[PDB]
Design a protein around this ligand. Sequence first.
Ligand SMILES: [Ca+2]
Lengths: 217, 101
Amino acid sequence: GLLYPFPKDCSQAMLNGDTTSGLYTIYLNGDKAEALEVFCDMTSDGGGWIVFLRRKNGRENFYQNWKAYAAGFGDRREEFWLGLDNLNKITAQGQYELRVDLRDHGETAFAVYDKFSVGDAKTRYKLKVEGYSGTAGDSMAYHNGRSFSTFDKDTDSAITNCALSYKGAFWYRNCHRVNLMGRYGDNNHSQGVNWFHWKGHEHSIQFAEMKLRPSNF
Amino acid sequence: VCSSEPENVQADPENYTSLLVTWERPRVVYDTMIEKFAVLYQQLDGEDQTKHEFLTDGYQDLGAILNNLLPNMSYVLQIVAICTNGLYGKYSDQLIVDMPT
Ligand SMILES: [Ca+2]
């Protein structure tokens, strides 16, 4: 911890010589008072990623209310959500890219977006995402510009309540091409862990991670 | 063709002149995929027999708000799926809604 004594993300932690995935303490804006323990993915395409969503076995409940999605929940070594307030503070300290890793029955795919940011609470955590590359298909472009929606705070573009109807929480529009906080193992139309351009709306994905690191890292 | 009928259609007046209608996705889709839904409605016992068609934006938002309806008038509506090749599926059962005075 010498180049960056208070690394502000997993990329600076990796530059300090931490090259094994696991739990690390980062410091938002390099501030020792703003410590945050995160899971770092240090192997995917060179590493240095903060993981902020993991689905892998359906043990954790992702049908949670606005306060839970603002604050985060779950064991960061297992299934978890980092929290929207954290995501805003991280994506505001610089320019970050998004990576999504997907696995299902021995097949894998990924998507990278060159630009990814989440607004603060007063924007209702508005999503900005653009610049797709990868193999999973560009499903997040549909969600660009949307505020976050939970079953108890409907901000989506639909007449109905997307989060209530499709048993999750997301930057819903009307309603989704991505539903990675949906109901685990649920192959009913649009209800599961969906990435539309990879497996459609009637196939729930076994494993999914969303992660971020500085652009051009 | 296209699909079986939308299920469990329900409708409640929202305000004095609007109606909120919801339904469930057809259980069976035959070949082509569902692209959107049509909400078909007309006055039940009124003189204006204009047949109205509201088309939804996409296939996931299983609800619609109908505006510009007349108080003290009954309406009949049906929901139907429309597939990517333009074909209409089976129509839902008719639902009669009475707007209050
Ligand atoms: Ca809504």
